[PDB]
Amino acid sequence: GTTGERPFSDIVTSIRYWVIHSITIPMLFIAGWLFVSTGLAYDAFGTPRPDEYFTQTRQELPILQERYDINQEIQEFN
Amino acid sequence: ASLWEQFCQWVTSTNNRIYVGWFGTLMIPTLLTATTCFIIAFIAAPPVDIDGIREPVAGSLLYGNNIISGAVVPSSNAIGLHFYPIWEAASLDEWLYNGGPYQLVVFHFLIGIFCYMGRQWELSYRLGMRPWICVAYSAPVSAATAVFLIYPIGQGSFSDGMPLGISGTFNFMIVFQAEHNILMHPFHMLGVAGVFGGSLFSAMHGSLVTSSLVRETTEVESQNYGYKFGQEEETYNIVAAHGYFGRLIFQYASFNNSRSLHFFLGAWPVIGIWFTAMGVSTMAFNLNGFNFNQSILDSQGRVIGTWADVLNRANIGFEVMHERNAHNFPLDLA
Amino acid sequence: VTYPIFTVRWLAVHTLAVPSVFFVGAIAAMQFIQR
Amino acid sequence: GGRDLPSTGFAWWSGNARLINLSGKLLGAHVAHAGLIVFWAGAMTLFEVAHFIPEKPMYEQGLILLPHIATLGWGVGPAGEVTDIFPFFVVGVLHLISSAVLGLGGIYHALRGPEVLEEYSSFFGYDWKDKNQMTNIIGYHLILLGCGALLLVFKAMFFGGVYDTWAPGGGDVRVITNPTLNPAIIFGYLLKAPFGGEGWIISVNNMEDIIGGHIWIGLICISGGIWHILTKPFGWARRALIWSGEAYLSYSLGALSLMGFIASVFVWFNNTAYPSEFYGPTGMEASQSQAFTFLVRDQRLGANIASAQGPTGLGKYLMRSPSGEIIFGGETMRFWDFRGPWLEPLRGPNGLDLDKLRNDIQPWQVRRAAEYMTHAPLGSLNSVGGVITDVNSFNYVSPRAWLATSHFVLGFFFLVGHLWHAGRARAAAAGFEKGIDRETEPTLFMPDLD
Amino acid sequence: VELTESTRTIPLDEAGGTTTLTARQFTNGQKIFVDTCTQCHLQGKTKTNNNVSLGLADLAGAEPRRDNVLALVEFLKNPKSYDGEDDYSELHPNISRPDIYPEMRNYTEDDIFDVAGYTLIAPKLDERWGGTIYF
Amino acid sequence: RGWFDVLDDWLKRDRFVFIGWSGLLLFPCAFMALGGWLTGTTFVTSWYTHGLASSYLEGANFLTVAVSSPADAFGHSLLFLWGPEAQGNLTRWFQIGGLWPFVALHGAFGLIGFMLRQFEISRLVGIRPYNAIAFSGPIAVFVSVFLMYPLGQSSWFFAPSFGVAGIFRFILFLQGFHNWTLNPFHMMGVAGILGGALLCAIHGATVENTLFEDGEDSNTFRAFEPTQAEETYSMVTANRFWSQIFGIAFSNKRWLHFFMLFVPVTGLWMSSVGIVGLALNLRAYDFVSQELRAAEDPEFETFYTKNILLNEGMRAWMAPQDQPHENFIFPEEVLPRGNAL
Amino acid sequence: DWRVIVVVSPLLIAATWAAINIGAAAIRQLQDVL
Ligand code: CLA
Ligand code: CLA
Ligand code: CLA
Ligand code: CLA
Ligand SMILES: CC1=C(/C=C/C(C)=C/C=C/C(C)=C/C=C/C=C(C)/C=C/C=C(C)/C=C/C2=C(C)CCCC2(C)C)C(C)(C)CCC1
Ligand SMILES: CC1=C(/C=C/C(C)=C/C=C/C(C)=C/C=C/C=C(C)/C=C/C=C(C)/C=C/C2=C(C)CCCC2(C)C)C(C)(C)CCC1
Ligand SMILES: CC1=C(/C=C/C(C)=C/C=C/C(C)=C/C=C/C=C(C)/C=C/C=C(C)/C=C/C2=C(C)CCCC2(C)C)C(C)(C)CCC1
Ligand SMILES: [Ca+2]
Ligand SMILES: [Cl-]
Ligand SMILES: [Cl-]
Ligand SMILES: [Fe+2]
Fold first, then answer.
1. Which atom of ligand 1 approaches the CA of D382 most closely?
2. What's the total number of domains in chain F?
3. Which UniProt keywords apply (chain G)?
4. Reduced to 3 states, what is the DSSP secondary structure of residue C1?
């Protein structure tokens, strides 16, 4: 009933899989960590940091109202 | 031999068109009582002072309701959890005004459905079946008991039981959400998974069986005539259905054992409904759904809204309007 | 015996698992953000 | 006994079914599980003691075991203030250590002890069909349960007494000197309607009735123990019941479901065996307290609360119950059966008394009503107190809510377990628990329905 | 923005005095408020009498004004009616009556000052502070 | 062997994950939809479209994250990354809610691809395609709710947001503004879904409790063999049981399984028809006869009129926060509310 | 952005680890399928 590929239990019970993955899996975990912890995520996605939801001049919700010029609108919201 | 033995043989007879049984000897009278009263009250009952504030609510068709709006109205908040049989009313008119029909119908209905579940066991025993259809039936029974008995008990009044009507059901639901946030309660989430998944699995199983039917008919007659009642031969090709499904998702996700498949079909919705019944039964004691109102604060300390806050706004809107004349004090505790 | 290492299955496995682990690391890091 | 499917016929997920006829292994499982119970009692008590702020009320701190110890009269004094924290610690320790011992014994029996006990001793060996031995074990355990009931009685009478929330001068630990042995009261409790205003046994409202009922329970249980040691089941019982291990399990499951439902109701309504001092207000208590709080406030403002009609025309503050009694108005009309030690000094023969309401309300009653109104058993699953539309800053869920909800859920699932095992026991006794025999399919010998 | 110094700057006394809580002072004040005052003053409301809330208008309308930190601390030592006519020290939690208010016998003067400062800072972060019970 | 047939061979190989020609549409589009949703719920805010935090990065949890609908100012703009709004700026595209159409559109085409996959695999293995026909139900729901309803409304903003609490918000919004519970088409949907769950439970239990004694173990699961020719449970006994318990019973297995398909699928389709109605505000909001009687007779109260009052309260209290682009300003004194609450 | 460098370097480390521990057999397989 096998379509050709190695069974998963075989692979994940092998030494070589674990020599590879005890490195690769933690590396991805800590890459995602660092992505968050360096602040890169905020800048990449434009998500406000806890101190940037409001500014010393905009105390209300920065709701977009403009149909085509949202870059300027966002920059004026800060 | 004896008259009693002959009666026993009759009640427990598997030859009766409708099985009676010992549980049936309670089911039939109580269910007929509930049905007769329900029909009479839904058609012709006068208005009921559900909130106990002398503000009677018209439930019956003759008082201006349609089928959608009609209901048997829960008994008065003044009654609370007190037993209100007909003989405790000074007059039938008094009994009706205070919502006695609701109590009569509900108590008989609940006795009847528990006896129905017992009767399912009894007949399976008489037929030499396995005994657990009644266990599956205990899920709807649990939910019905939660909405008609447990929730009023926790809340302290049959006035807070689900009304016996369509719009009344909706009213019950809206107020329940306003007061308990049932949507944000994981047991209701599990109930939703139960019913969505049960419908999914019903569709999936029905469609796979229908897809793998063995050719026994022509294109003119219904393929249903390909199955003859009481054949042992299988009417569909389960191996072809497994081939299809294990290629649709992947091989090891598809059942090839019909027994395990049907156990799963039984168990999934039943467990989901048990969980949602328990959710309603525990919100009866005001252990409510999750409250994330003002969970996210900005650095200064201002609240940042989430969809939970929007939901709470809707809940407040429902809450401030419900039973608009019933509250004298600022907290809806009772 | 002696199966191929890389396959369509390998790719389907990783396409999901790899971003999953990265995202989990990100969300773990999120757990210690202070306001 | 086998330990796999081919040699037992049970899968791993039903593996404990393999123990049905291995009496020694089954005893080991039971003793180890009893160890788990006692372990949780001890560990949870130690946790609660560690997480206890002894000047903040118990019900504000997520405690369910400490109130049980306080109600028994240990470590508390007037109004339930925690005098000595050491008795709570000792209860927890004793349970933890005996749990160690129970776990060791259960492990011995389950893992090394004799597989079956019947060929080692007639006394401890049992057969599920041995009606005499089954009733012997019922008898031994009935004697033990009667002893436990009399232990409660002895604690209340001769070992410091119990906490009486109804104590004059204020709720306090008091010694019960005159328990009611009068069988009329004791067993008329069992005859009261399970409905509003009667509250079948939930309505027991004085430690004298509780202690006297426990004296009666002790005597009944001990006499039943002796009765079952010295007799065998009669013909009627033999003909009506299924006599098998799974049948006895199903019977006990039904019993447990009943008890769980009863306890959930008991903790929800009763404020005598569950003093509000330790368990917080009942929902009824909190609603009544809100009505009382605003009656008092508006009266101080000058409202004539006797004659003030609300918007609907019913009295804002006071009204009549359907039987005429003077009760708090508003939705709390449903809760007029409520009785609590802070409210009864204002109740006259007719219900609430205008004269007491106008010149007998004490500052401690005002404080208590405020406290109880603000600790109404309302809360979210993540322990945000108050009505569900409130915001996150009040971390409270009533212990009554935790106990009632948990015990209703356990009662239901044990009813389900009773149904499962009763059905299975019947089917196995009749021999069709494994499916329909194709040769003798009963329906095939049955006439068609129409 | 941050929980800045100006945001933490609040009236100290009635003569125009001014005190700034530190971040630690504000955090302890919030902690105390949630532990002992959130049961009756969630979101600045007064569950048992919402004619007298913790809002800025209500706080300043008392006699004397309670919109400054010293007056709040005085109230928490010796609670009075809103017009300052009756003695509420048997009816309101206060540090002066640990015999009837045990939840308060462990609080210092620093703790009371912190909670009063939090009471003054919270309204400007929440437009719902001190409104209607259902609001 | 032409290159087309060589490709067809490779695509239709028996492997762990069948690809097929339909996989060309399904897998990239399903991946886009799923990864977009995960990315949005992990990292992307709704601060500029809704004034809401909607991602784990902002402190939300599983229940409160969402790929929120785009700002109402964009109408029904498809909001391509390269479109006139975001103009290729990925960060802005995230901030304006470009992920919502991204997920919605890739999901619609992934759903198409999945149903094509059902057809393709059914054809290859040689069975009738009733699984695809059944899947048409979920497709109708997705098209009607996530595409047709917002297209009838002012903008994508009123589409359901791809999140748990976002969906709950959509649900309550439909109750309060459309009185969706009163809608007969929703009622038929409810009946279909509840009946499907009932059928699932009752059929599974019936089969499990009419099994033939085909093995010696108490474990009855190992007394089945997929190649066995005979029925594994007694249809005759099942029919007799249900005839005597309920009065009627299935006697035709094929009809039973077709009914199990027909009920939930028909329910989904009817509720989709109702949602199409709501897209144009064509609601079953009111019963005019009762409205008129109540407007003239201040003693006439039904559960219907009570529900109307609840809806009024919900709209007034929720609109300012739920529709922040509108700048609704409802002073406290205009909010409807009952006594003392 | 140095943040990009520190976020990418673990990915490259994982990739090169997997390569150095699987490359012989991977190239074997690549060659065999031509
Ligand atoms: C009757 C049982 C019971 C009750 C009423 C309580 C009540 C309480 N506990 Mg507790 N506890 C229990 C058992 C119980 N516990 C057990 C068995 C353990 C060992 C794990 C603990 C260990 C524990 C700790 C460490 C703590 C508590 C705490 C608390 C308090 C906070 C509750 C909370 O937020 O939890 C949250 C609620 C949940 C996590 C939901 C649980 C839902 C379960 C999974 C329901 C299962 C459903 C069903 C039975 C599934 C089987 C059915 C099947 C057929 C499908 C509260 C008063 C806290 C406290 O305040 O200490 C002072 C605390 O820190 N408990
Ligand atoms: C209900 C629980 C229970 C039951 C029915 C049994 C039953 C049995 N045990 Mg076991 N055991 C238990 C718990 C239990 N045990 C626990 C908790 C431990 C850990 C200490 C042990 C450790 C243990 C060992 C090491 C052995 C047994 C053995 C036996 C068998 C012989 C009994 C005998 O003749 O010795 C004589 C009985 C007595 C001398 C009576 C003494 C009664 C106790 C010890 C004194 C306290 C009485 C107390 C006041 C009564 C109420 C208890 C209280 C906590 C409420 C027998 C079938 C033996 C065996 O299997 O033989 C082959 C054996 O080797 N047990
Ligand atoms: C857990 C403790 C326990 C257990 C498991 C048993 C078990 C048993 N006892 Mg029993 N018994 C006990 C304690 C216990 N007893 C005590 C403490 C006493 C002293 C009072 C007795 C005195 C006693 C006597 C005199 C007899 C038994 C008998 C029996 C056997 C059959 C009885 C029966 O069918 O039950 C169920 C009861 C019935 C089928 C009769 C119907 C009872 C009514 C109609 C049920 C209605 C209850 C109601 C719905 C619940 C509401 C609560 C409340 C308001 C009543 C059975 C093995 C019989 C026996 O075989 O003798 C050796 C017998 O004659 N026992
Ligand atoms: C004292 C109570 C009691 C006892 C002694 C038994 C004993 C037994 N049961 Mg039973 N049962 C009970 C109560 C009990 N049951 C209840 C209350 C129910 C209703 C749910 C059932 C329903 C039931 C079924 C359907 C079956 C049994 C079966 C059995 C037999 C084997 C079971 C086994 O191996 O477990 C193995 C244990 C597991 C597989 C683990 C189960 C884990 C559960 C489902 C979730 C735990 C949730 C819990 C609250 C913790 C939450 C965790 C959270 C932190 C995530 C065995 C003799 C089997 C049988 O009939 O044998 C002939 C069987 O098929 N029981
Ligand atoms: C058989 C079996 C089983 C079971 C088991 C069991 C059930 C058990 C148990 C057991 C137990 C039940 C146990 C125990 C224990 C205990 C201990 C071990 C203890 C102790 C101690 C200590 C050490 C303490 C200390 C302390 C003190 C003294 C006080 C203070 C605090 C502290 C904590 C420090 C299972 C399922 C696995 C499976 C297989 C089979
Ligand atoms: C302590 C106390 C008290 C007391 C109590 C008492 C005194 C009791 C009791 C009780 C009792 C004394 C009981 C009982 C019971 C019984 C039961 C529960 C039963 C039953 C039944 C059954 C189960 C049966 C069944 C059957 C039938 C129906 C027929 C056929 C056969 C059979 C068996 C199946 C009081 C309240 C005062 C107070 C509080 C505390
Ligand atoms: C956006 C976008 C895109 C896409 C992307 C993608 C496609 C991605 C992705 C992604 C992904 C794909 C991610 C992932 C993930 C994941 C996660 C986040 C997970 C999780 C989980 C969990 C948490 C689980 C848990 C559990 C449970 C609950 C049960 C049992 C146990 C366990 C542990 C399993 C592109 C660039 C094209 C362009 C632009 C836009
Ligand atoms: Ca407190
Ligand atoms: Cl309403
Ligand atoms: Cl009220
Ligand atoms: Fe089937």
1. 34
2. 1
3. Membrane, Photosynthesis, Photosystem II, Thylakoid, Transmembrane, Transmembrane helix
4. coil
